[PDB]
Chain length 202, copies 10
């Protein structure tokens, strides 16, 4: 192929996967709760532009790697991979659904979140920890492992404290009400919506 046969295939499967998930009206993904609110909303308001995230090479790397590593978790830890669930909360009155997909779960029960930075500075990153903390709440699990596979180091962290629904709720209204953007100062640097976004840190 002019792109290359393997390249063409991975890009084609990754686009179909990205197109796969239409988000319901009142559903908030776990991953959205720990990202910039404007970014989340842009993903919904500017889907055509949002599609370019499919062609991010570190994303493709990360997916192949979750696939690699998830195989071994199935076959030695008897784990469930890519496990979805919902759980409701009420926000300013309205009922919102919080939707998450865990990289792996083990059945007490263990949630496993796999990450791959290109750098091992500062591990574990607060936003990766929060995410996992929220999945603990989501799946009502007692134990969490956050495991980083980076070129400079492999490191694994036990995270066992779930986030309190009270803060989950307040992370939620911050997402719905676009209250504080960006969520972390580093987000704008890599954000594809910074070309049009008024809130962009400069």
């Amino acid at each position: 192929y002019f792109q290359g046969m393997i390249t063409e295939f991975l890009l084609k499967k990754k686009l179909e996967e990205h197109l796969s998930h239409v988000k319901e009206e009142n559903t908030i993904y776990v991953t959205d709760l720990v990202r910039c609110p404007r970014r989340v909303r842009y993903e919904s308001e500017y889907k055509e532009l949002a599609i370019s995230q499919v062609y991010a090479p570190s994303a493709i790397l990360g997916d192949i790697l979750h696939l690699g590593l998830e195989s071994v978790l199935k076959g030695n830890f008897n784990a469930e991979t890519e496990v979805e669930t919902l759980r409701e909360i009420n926000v300013g009155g309205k009922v919102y659904k919080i939707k998450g997909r865990a990289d792996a779960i083990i059945r007490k029960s263990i949630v496993i979140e796999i990450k791959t930075s290109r750098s091992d500075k500062g591990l574990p990153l607060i936003h990766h920890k929060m995410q996992l903390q929220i999945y603990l709440w989501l799946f009502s699990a007692e134990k969490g492992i956050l495991v980083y596979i980076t070129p400079d180091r492999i490191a694994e962290y036990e995270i066992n404290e779930p986030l309190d629904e009270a803060t989950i709720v307040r992370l939620a209204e911050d997402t719905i009400m676009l209250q504080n953007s960006p969520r972390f100062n580093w987000e704008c640097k890599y954000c594809i919506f910074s070309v049009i976004c008024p809130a962009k840190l400069t």
Copy 2:
């Protein structure tokens, strides 16, 4: 858990896999033909030091990506993966076995696929990776080859369809056996675990 439940396991398996590859006396790996001769012989003389390679996180990351990208190939292109073959050559007046292991092979005619990962997409494709693949095309008598890099800055795929001819494999082999030009590439010494005892280290 001291090291971690997950990483304890990956380390255990990777140590196991490393110890499982025993090399015969007159056998040269394809990967040996495109790297420093002294390094190849140190890996045979100082195996207890060579074990330290098992723990290089880039190798662990690299092994997990092969496992992922290999399962996608097996699933959607009807590829065999981790395929071994041997082939004999005469070097000097003596028979050696060249052994290789393809990351994946596809039966259309056959296509040898070599997966590569790195932190950098600089200089792609690297000459020593292309040689590796060109040698596998002779080893497997295969018609076509794909070298595909998965790196954080770029996914890049190259088509290598020309095999190295046997006389040049023989000459690569001669270097290997007789320690002729060490290192093979000037960048190697910097990452070599043997540089600390090696007189030919570039400085």
Copy 3:
């Protein structure tokens, strides 16, 4: 307003003008002719990714300038703006159409006006801009063109009068068709949105 009443509308109108470029087969636009062949092909093959060029602020800005300076050229030089034509050439065996849209043509005798913005006034006139206009001379059978730069550090105008010969246009069209000379200019890969998947990317 989430994005903002005015910006919402500009991005909406620019998305639609983008999506309305139904590309007919055997048709090569002048602006494709002077860019990297693989990039043109990437644009036809990964349209979902290519749409992201819609949101380039330099393109929105450049368009607005074009509109700005275009209203003036209509009402004072009596020119036609956004003027589409096409012309057939014989490339190898096959017959291809070269299509173009001049920014402005004043008639008197014809003059083709190409307007450019840029962040920098360094190196004016740029050789790809020049080439593009020299191709528009041939395409509209004009004998005079003007390249005008509106930059923050300078306003500069250039009289470009020699059209490109058909043989050079043909030689360029080959490269587009058979993916040769990628990239055309070494600076291109730096700003190419396909650099993340292209194996020919300069590094």
Copy 4:
């Protein structure tokens, strides 16, 4: 010699300068957020002030206002380049606070100011905000929009609170009374009067 297109742009731009001739007691809204000494110098050294006509970023900004303004007319039902004025007492004397709004949309009303900047640092710039808050008073609008078209980014801000009449008076006091020059530390770097000005920041 100079070039057909640009010889025209410069001619046409000189005439638009030479046409507006500021009466004795007129202050432009743009003068209230500039350096008072610079305002005064433009009045006192009009042969030198002419040199501003040929700033290439002014020509660019003017071409952009044109293109964009014609889009505001065509699709938003807006009036472009809307002149108005308002008189005020600054210590017994009557001053004309004159202003030209880039565009207005009357249905009950919205002032839009368009800006072109070489970069997107610091958006919205406070002098630009203030200028817009002056126009809301000037044109008695309840709403304004500040829109930036820069090579790095497009962004848009909703400014809804007009400046107090008193504050505008104080601004005019500082303007005629030459009180705090420059108004901002970046001004002198670009000012054509720095070669004769004693207040120049070094």
Copy 5:
């Protein structure tokens, strides 16, 4: 407002600039050692050209000649500010090469040029020498004295060979046909026409 002294110096400087009336067919000596495109801009965009009047290094230079010229008149018995023109033939058409010498001494005469620079680097600079050598042929003089007063050093050079009338032709030609612009590669950096000039070195 500007201050009592500077007002006067500038009004007088301005008025001396608007006085210089350039006849159709006349090229200045100083124009022969400058960028052909630059002297043309000066007649085509006079309103912009007026900003040179406010170049502080020019004011300072003037003030210098003023101070120095009592010395020249009293003790050297020279005429200062000596205007003259001469006729050359270029392209069959015939031109007036006109010049103003800082100071002349008739005895066998010696023309003298005075320069200020912030810097004594490279003295004498080649376009100053070239200038003196055109005043030598203009005034048909046998001796020239170029003298620099810089803050780093005072320096004086004897230029006693004039340019050949033949040479002067190629340079008046350059100036009319706008051939080699800019004449010296350092000109564009300081040129007030660089903002609209397509030949600007960049």
Copy 6:
């Protein structure tokens, strides 16, 4: 000889020396009490990786220096070299042996600890001092000497106060229960387990 006749021998004797020291379950080395508790536990959980330490050239230099300076001591100060001893302590009500080996002991006894660094910066280093102070406790010796042989300086320090047994017990607790890792901020930088350790300083 591929490696070299002399080097092959040194690396064979180092490796066999390193393989000879197997640790019993309730035994802590004196060197362990002044190092990172995690690193200590890595050296016993990842013995195959730990073996790479045998090939650190600075260790080989160090050992040969010890051997040389050990021989001088023996033949002119009637010292015993490489003296091992063992003393028992109570931790969490359990019995551990602290085991150590002094480079040399003289005659009233003096424990000598020899160090070689490639730099004389900051001597004596706190962790080297503690080691020695522990050997005083261990050998119930009354004097300690810490001598550094570096390429920039020879420096000798008299250290005669032992660490009390309670400090030793505290150090042993940290070691058993991985309390504070790394013990010293500079450790991670040179630790062969950094590549798999979650506590690595970054």
Copy 7:
């Protein structure tokens, strides 16, 4: 012709002007209340060395520019130039005279003009300059003063209208006489010609 016709003369006349003034006993000049006390004493003790100040091209440029600007001041403002005067002050129960020479004075009441020339327009107006003029306002009992700079980057005029109070002048005078706090300004030693023998040089 060795040195040059013009410069030879300029140097000759500058030298004479230097030797033309000899300082009175119990007299302090204003120019000296604003300079380092040791330097002022050095100028009496080491007149042969002090004479090198004559050849300082900055001073030459400086004198010429005072001449030209003065010429304009006296034929258009009807200014008096180089106006000498004195006042008496008590210091140490002893009587001293402060003397000075205003560059120009102009009427309306009197305006003291001080002219300055500097290489750079940095930090205008420099505090010591301002100080000099304030002392002249007290000396001439003038109520209004103009400091005017002619630099290559900029022309800048300042109205200074407060005179220094008499106590302060006395203090400046005490320092001058008792050599108390030298240098007066930290930047002085860098240019002082006596830095080579001065114990107090800042270093």
Copy 8:
């Protein structure tokens, strides 16, 4: 012990060793042949200053390493250590005794003598250094040995080189002539920087 017990003893023993070796008017050490001639003569003419080189901590470090590594060599390889020997050379019809002391010798390893020279430095840059190899090659002539090993123990690297060609006698005579006639000083460019005689030497590179 104000200086310290161990330090005091090493310094005392090293000054003794240095002072034990008085050099005769017609001998040339091997070590001299690969050094600056002016410096070698300075070591005879300014012996009081020369003595400061005793207190160079790299040299004390260096000698302890030789001691310790040498003791390995006497055990497992049956080497002699610090082996002194002498060989004569003609230079302008004057006869000269070239004298050297090899760090270790293996007299008979399968019908071969091996001279071993041990070296230490703080960096492994550029190994092996040409003046080290020359020194080993002169010993090879001195002992008439067939094999040479130059081994570097450095903090970055251990590295061993097999050097088997001895310098011709003519080359050694050329080295000797320069030593005697003070011909080309310094011998190597990096010398003066470390040379304790640079403070009085006119040939010092700047």
Copy 9:
């Protein structure tokens, strides 16, 4: 001449003068009082290494200067040069004699200390000030002059307050008990015993 006729003689002469300083028993020079006490002690325990100081070229230059300048002080100020004297003090129970040698003295009495340096920075240097304040006490002089001949500056300083015994005694204390080592933090950088000294500052 291998070394050279003149330098040979100079070094010969310098070595002789260095060697001819027989150090009496309970004796501390003034020049030792102002330096690190360990350095003083090293100079007494390692005579052979201290001899290298004889070949410091700045000390040779130093001595040639003192000679030349001292010839002027006899000649035109009728002063005694290289004047020697001592004076007992009492240190905590014992009796030591402080001994000094002043560069020049003029008889009331003026002690002159002459100093060179390649740099005039920070003059006068406190340790030179201290040396001379001690001379005034040793010689019962009332006035002192410190004169620096340096390539950038000649500078002379009047020092008229001598140190009292209490402080001199306290300085001798340090010299005896090896306290306050080094006295000044720049000393180790130049000290030839830093190669063996444990208190070297690093």
Copy 10:
């Protein structure tokens, strides 16, 4: 006020300098090795040249020849400050090449020249060497010693080849005609007459 010793030294240097009147057809040897214009300037601008007297470099250099020269009279039985002249023939006229040797040793005769410098870089400097080569001719001596006393090193050089008469005359030729200024490119950087000289290098 300036200091007792300092005053005397500067007072004496001044007198010394002021003594030396150069007669009409004379050229010092030290003038043959210098810029011709500087030698000329020292004649035509005497007042300025007196500033050379206050060079601290030179005062140090003087005090230094005094010390060393008193060793030279007293151990090598030499003549310090030996003055002589020799007539040469240039352009028909007869000139007196005077010179003063720092010292001479009379056995068969040796000229000694002492130099000071704050740097030992590049010894021996070519122009110090020429100076001694001309002195060998002047005194017709067979041997010469150039000796430097710098603070980094003492270094002695033996110079025996006396300079040619023909090229001595070619030097005087340029001294007279101002043929090549400066002689050496480093000269202008320390020249007191660079402030008024048109030859100065920049």
